[PDB]
Coordinates of C-alpha atoms in Angstrom, one line a residue:
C1 CA 0.0 -3.7 4.8
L2 CA 3.4 -5.3 3.7
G3 CA 7.0 -3.8 3.3
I4 CA 7.4 -3.4 -0.6
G5 CA 7.8 0.0 -2.5
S6 CA 5.0 1.5 -4.8
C7 CA 1.9 2.8 -2.9
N8 CA -0.2 2.3 0.4
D9 CA -2.5 -0.8 1.3
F10 CA -5.2 0.4 3.9
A11 CA -4.7 3.9 5.7
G12 CA -1.2 4.2 7.3
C13 CA -0.6 0.3 7.9
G14 CA 2.2 -0.2 5.1
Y15 CA 2.7 -0.7 1.4
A16 CA 0.9 -2.1 -1.8
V17 CA 1.8 -3.1 -5.5
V18 CA -1.9 -2.7 -6.7
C19 CA -2.6 1.0 -5.7
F20 CA -5.8 1.7 -3.6
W21 CA -5.3 5.6 -4.0

């Protein structure tokens, strides 16, 4: 849940660098 540009943090909330999916 931040505004970067690789994958998603926790189900629709925002972005992630370390990919949960």
